[PDB]
Design a protein around this ligand. Structure first.
Ligand SMILES: O=P(O)(O)OC[C@H]1O[C@@H](O[C@H]2[C@H](O)[C@@H](O)[C@H](O)O[C@@H]2CO)[C@H](O)[C@@H](O)[C@@H]1O
Ligand SMILES: O=P(O)(O)OC[C@H]1O[C@@H](O)[C@H](O)[C@@H](O)[C@@H]1O
Lengths: 462, 462
């Protein structure tokens, strides 16, 4: 079987998120985000780590882009911090905030790197939470649209690729069901209402994008764990049907088709959990087709039958499914599956169901890297993980999936939302830890040079 | 979770096919079908059994309909023999042939039974095979359309529910890949060409139906074996992705969306097997949406990884998948799997992928039946099989699938295409065998009274 090459304009990328890298949390007129406030609540984050400084990319962006150019990155995906642009979410635009992203975009373009702008990575301005509960109010649809249009107007001439909501399923479920992320709520009814409003906000911004960036490409990015049945027991295959629909189609069908899947809807309706639908909602959701599906991928999930008095280790929904360890894949040191074939499966499923091109917006390995004498980081484990995923992407392309690019997570080490700094993801080590910022110096890991060679050969040497 | 009831207008049905029941193979001007000719080839059918007489429904239809009314059937699904209506396939209409179906439809309507007319059950007139190779020629599109339009014009005022091609995947694959059915060809290239022509014929007649029967409901019926992965090994899940797309989406995506799935298309193209596409084909296929998906269901299929030098007992496609026995399902005395949950899974998959209502056009158990003195046939095994499938349909309805009805296969015993009469499917035993027509008398089996009670309670008592 001859494999197809990676296409000539394949976006070999790397990625970050604003709160995780920028720092400068109160500089240049930036307003408070919900994460600025949440992470300072005692006990919320490991060792009290927060984004006040992070890795200081706000001040060190020129050095970081110089490293990207040394690597030969074709694309860099970053998020814009809404609270830098509209400190209060709505109201007056902050020109100094826009100017940072203008300088970053110019730095990228001057080095031949395609910017991929992510509108939203979980950091809605605290003022919108204070005023109306942020994602629980339809008011956010127009406020988010005004913010997005501002970015489209300022940067649409120079940015072709845009991501709207990044991992909506995570920020909504962690914020409103698990209570782990802002606003720290544990209420499924509120979760599904906020989720519906986020769906409308995504659709509204895509419609606006067609007016302001007619030659651009836009899509949401979904945190996709493809589901597997444990085996060929009919009840386990049925559990897989339930899980793939409830965990995955629930989001991606809205993004692609503007419709929630019916079995999941009817289940929520039987629990009194389905969202409130207003006139015009379906019309808007259906009339906002994206150019691609963004995919954040780390692992698959295997499921089995879960009786109605069952699991609510394993997690699941009684009567629908429960998770079970997959005996046929390796695991990371944090019990995450390592399943590169699962990435090919997920790509195939998206092409098969929606016929959409895919931008892989995030994939990477987190591990406790050691800085050895001479400023050397031997992260062969990260090379092995990335190599295997890139190989499976090439097989998915050969199968016929249109993959637009691959953004490794992450370019530099960064702050995790709740777990501090020690589990590192970067190609570039940042010298700091949970106790202090040290000197924040950037140190290329072995994986940096491996990926440099991948890009130079367009994937022929992995 | 309590099960939902069956909807009040649920079509409790039973079904047959013209060649399998009618007889009267050369009466009232009927022309030869491809099956009249094929079954008379020596050695082709068990003990030389053929459709010359079958169970003589052509002459005994009044008694058979009287039995349906005694059972309280809500619907009877039958096929129309094209060669009775157009003995030469095209050319002159045969009024005596139409008159049989008119008399049958009047008998059904006089007893309050909904006719479900199936346009095609494998019996294209031999004259069209001789003239141009039947399904291998685009000429059949207009000839099939003129036949269908004739039926719509004569019967559309009295028939709401119509099935177009019944089990296209079977008549095409058995006729052109396995050589088991007419025309006895074993050539994948020819199979995919004939299949594409059948797709166009289906779409053309649905378009005609929208004009002639504006209040009717129409759809194709697909012989659906839902695929399962053997286990959660990523390569086996990938084999399942390949198999479901190649075996199932290849047909149902064309019916629902007018498009072949891309990974399967690209594989066939790499083998030189993809069909020839003419201008206008995609437009026609996309503009012929059905009201429902018909489903003929007997069993699921489990698959596993198949290396490129592998199977092509097990069957499959090297590099894509191969079948494997599922250790987690029962079997009939003929080694067909018994998997009622698989029916729920298939119904869920069709709703989840296509949002279509489903008419279950065929499901039943074939087994030897013993005629006991006093005209008693105790077929508790058939009751058990049907009960378990109906129970799973009720669960699919509860999940949110719109199931329009359920046609048990079959109403009376009938002639098998290749295997004679001994493996019986009816609610009504027919006293004949492979060697003799005996007296052709109809004898109600125990399952007849069971289904009568199902219908009386609208499925509440199973
Ligand atoms: O008497 P048999 O051979 O058991 O035939 C029963 C009915 O078979 C249905 O089609 C089956 C077919 O027999 C299988 O070979 C194939 O794999 O499955 C299809 C699935 O529907 C026919 O629909 C019916 O006309 C026969 O009575
Ligand atoms: O450090 P952790 O907890 O493994 O988190 C890693 C990543 O988890 C992903 O879900 C998020 O998209 C990233 O923002 C985050 O960096």
């Amino acid at each position: 079987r001859h494999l197809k090459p990676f296409p000539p304009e394949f976006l070999w990328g790397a990625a970050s998120a604003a709160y995780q890298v920028e720092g400068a949390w109160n500089e240049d007129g930036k307003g408070l985000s919900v994460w600025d406030v949440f992470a300072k609540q005692p006990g919320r984050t490991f060792k009290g780590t927060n984004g006040d400084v992070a890795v200081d990319h706000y001040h060190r962006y020129q050095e970081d882009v110089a490293l990207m150019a040394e690597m030969g990155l074709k694309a860099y995906r970053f998020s814009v911090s809404w609270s830098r642009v509209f400190p209060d979410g709505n109201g007056a635009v902050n020109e100094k905030g826009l100017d940072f992203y203008d300088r970053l975009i110019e730095e990228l373009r001057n080095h031949g790197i395609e910017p991929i702008v992510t509108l939203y990575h979980w950091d809605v301005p605290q003022a919108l939470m204070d005023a109306y509960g942020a994602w629980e109010s339809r008011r956010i649809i127009d406020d988010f649209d005004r913010y997005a249009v501002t970015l489209f107007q300022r940067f649409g001439d120079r940015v072709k690729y845009w991501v709207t909501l990044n991992q909506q399923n995570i920020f909504i479920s962690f914020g409103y069901r698990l209570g782990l992320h802002p606003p720290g709520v544990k209420d499924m009814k509120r979760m599904y209402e906020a989720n519906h409003i986020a769906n409308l906000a995504n659709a509204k911004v895509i419609q606006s994008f067609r007016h302001y960036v007619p030659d651009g490409k836009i899509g949401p990015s979904f945190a996709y764990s493809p589901m597997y049945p444990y085996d060929s027991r009919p009840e386990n295959v049925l559990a897989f049907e339930n899980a793939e629909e409830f965990q995955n189609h629930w989001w991606m069908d809205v993004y692609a088709w503007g419709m929630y899947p019916q079995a999941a809807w009817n289940y929520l309706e039987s629990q009194g959990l389905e969202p409130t639908v207003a006139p015009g909602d379906w019309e808007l959701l259906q009339a906002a087709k994206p150019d691609f599906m963004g995919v954040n991928y780390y692992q698959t999930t295997t499921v089995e039958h879960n009786p109605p008095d069952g699991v609510g280790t394993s997690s699941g929904i009684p009567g629908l499914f429960k998770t079970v360890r997959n005996p046929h894949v390796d695991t990371t040191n944090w019990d995450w599956a390592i399943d590169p074939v699962g990435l090919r499966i997920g790509l195939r499923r998206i092409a098969n169901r929606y016929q959409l091109p895919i931008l892989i917006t995030e994939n990477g390995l987190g591990e406790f890297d050691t800085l050895e004498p001479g400023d050397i980081v031997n992260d062969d484990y990260r090379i092995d993980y990335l190599r295997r995923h890139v190989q499976e992407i090439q097989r998915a392309i050969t199968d016929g999936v249109d993959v637009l690019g691959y953004c490794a997570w992450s370019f530099t080490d960064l702050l995790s939302w709740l777990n501090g700094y020690q589990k590192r993801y970067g190609f570039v080590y940042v010298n700091r830890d949970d106790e202090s910022e040290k000197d924040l110096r950037r140190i290329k890991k072995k994986s940096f040079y491996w990926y440099q060679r991948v890009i130079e050969t367009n994937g022929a040497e992995l």
